[PDB]
Amino acid sequence: APRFSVLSWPQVRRLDAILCESVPIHGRGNFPTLSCRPRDLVQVVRSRLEQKGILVHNVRLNGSAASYVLHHDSGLGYKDLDLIFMVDLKGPDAFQVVKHAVLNCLLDFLPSGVKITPMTLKEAYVQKLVKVCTESDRWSLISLSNNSGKNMELKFVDSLRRQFEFSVDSFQIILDSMLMFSQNPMSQSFHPTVTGESMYGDFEEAMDHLRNRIIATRNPEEIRGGGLLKYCNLLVRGFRPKSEVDMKTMQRYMCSRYFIDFPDIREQQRKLKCYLQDHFVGMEDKRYDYLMTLHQVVNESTVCLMGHERRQTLALIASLAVHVLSEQN
Numbered sequence: 300a301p302r303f304s305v306l307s308w309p310q311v312r313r314l315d316a317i318l319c320e321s322v323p324i325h326g327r328g329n330f331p332t333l334s335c336r337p338r339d340l341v342q343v344v345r346s347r348l349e350q351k352g353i354l355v356h357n358v359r360l361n362g363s364a365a366s367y368v369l370h371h372d373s374g375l376g377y378k379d380l381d382l383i384f385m386v387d388l389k390g391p392d393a394f395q396v397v398k399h400a401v402l403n404c405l406l407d408f409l410p411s412g413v414k415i416t417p418m419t420l421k422e423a424y425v426q427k428l429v430k431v432c433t434e435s436d437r438w439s440l441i442s443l444s445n446n447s448g449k450n451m452e453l454k455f456v457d458s459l460r461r462q463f464e465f466s467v468d469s470f471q472i473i474l475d476s477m478l479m480f481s482q483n484p485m486s487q488s489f490h491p492t493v494t495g496e497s498m499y500g501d502f503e504e505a506m507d508h509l510r511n512r513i514i515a516t517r518n519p520e521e522i523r524g525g526g527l528l529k530y531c532n533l534l535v536r537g538f539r540p541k542s543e544v545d546m547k548t549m550q551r552y553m554c555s556r557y558f559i560d561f562p563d564i565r566e567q568q569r570k571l572k573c574y575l576q577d578h579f580v581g582m583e584d585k586r587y588d589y590l591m592t593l594h595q596v597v598n599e600s601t602v603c604l605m606g607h608e609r610r611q612t613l614a615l616i617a618s619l620a621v622h623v624l625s626e627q628n
Contacts, residue, residue, distance in 0.1 A: 304502040306369070306472065306493040314360070314368045314472060314493065315485055322380065324405070325446035330423035332446065333408045338478055341382060343407055344453065347400045348386060353393060356385040358478075359471035359496075361454075361462070366470055369495065370509045374536040375468060378578070380451045383471060388457035394430050394439050397455050401441050426450065436460060448580035463498035464526050466505040466515045467538065471496050512538045515545065519552040524560025527553035528574050531592040535585060550600035557597075558608050568615055575619065583623075590620040 306314065317337060324333035345355045359365075362381030366373045388394065402417040405424050409415070421428070427442035427450075438456040445451055456462070463469035476491040497505045499517060508515050514533050516522065530553055540546035561567045579586050594616040601609035 300501050300504070302497050302500050302502055304495050304497075304506075306495055308487045308490060309371075310369050310495075311477075311490050311493055312485070313371060314474075314477065315490075317360070317364060317368065317380070318474070318477060322449075322451065323445055324408070324424055324451065325444045326423045328423060330420075331410060333405065333424070335408050337380060337382065338474075340404065340408075340451075341384075341474060342478060342482065343404045344401055345384065347403055348384070348397065351396050351400055353390065353396060353400075354387040356387075358385065358474045359383040360474060361471045362452075363468050365472045365495070366468055366509055368472055369470055369506065373467070373509055374512050374538060375533075376536075378449050378580075380445075380449070382451070382453050383462075384453065384455045386455045386457060388437050388439070388455065393457075394432070397439055398428070398441065401453060427452075448577050450577075461498070461518075461521050464516065464522060464529055465533065466497070466499040466501075466508045466517075467513070467533070468529075469497055469499040469505055471498060508541075512536075514538045514540045514549070516549060519549050522553055522556055524557045525570075527557045527593070527596065528570075531589055531596060532578060534592050534596075535589050547600065550596050551602070554597055554600040555602065558601075558605060558612075562608075564611050564615055567612060568619075571615065571619060575623075583626075586623045587620055590616050590623065594620070 319336055319338065321334050321336055324335065326332055341358050345358060348355050360368070360381065361383050362377060362379045363373065363375040364377040364380055366375050367377045386393075386397065388397070390396075398421075399417055402420045405420050406415060424443055425441055426444040427440070429440040429442075431438055435458065437458045438454060440455070441453045443451040443453070462471070472493060472495045474493075476493050480491045495502065499505045507513070514530065530549065540549060561570060575586050575589070579589070594613055597609060597612050597616065
């Protein structure tokens, strides 16, 4: 039952592809659209962080991209490129140093021209900035936009208890052995050894859920409100719970946490509109199936004490589904 595993050659081949594929970084306003390889961005960000005194232990690839590396036939696809930097943030002003380091990296990928302020680069390329500082969790996130609903999230984690929602998207692939390989063609008889970790706690059990398209988790009480939204995305993509008891348990927690995190129905509409716009760029027609899936889960798993909330949310979902249908003919 180990939570670690060494990647095979087809997995290493796909990991090298992702690290070498050029990705665009959209600039708001007059800023040019950048083009960088993920291996280069990791290298330049890690180097400058270490120059400013922030220790970088290792860098990982998370999200559905890691699942695609481990299993190309994953029903998940991959929209986000999630890069996790294992850094030491207990130092003074570490969050601001990380921010300015990444902003300085965007300055390097700019073409020949111009001494551009960090605040102007932030408004140009940073789509989201998150900072969490507590005795238990300490990390930061800087999100860049790939101008197609895709996001490049640079997460800098010092301490984070839970880094997974479900088993099928819980993989982090350490990249350090890949970056030192060049800094020649890669082959089956000559390729670096790569170690992967399953935040779900069992690499082979999670790989089984990925091959068989199973929805499973551990400690569902810790799942955030957004877990319900990802859950319905898994259902539309063909992933199904492992048993009926497992389904009712998971859905009850995700519905309960959904109302806790988003009590205001106005907050629900704004987040639901954002989720539909971001996760269906290549499949706008599937938005109806998603809302019907979400409508069913909310209707069947909302404790009978929250009847007003259940009826409130179902009306919002149905209203969004009508709007989607109204786009045709």
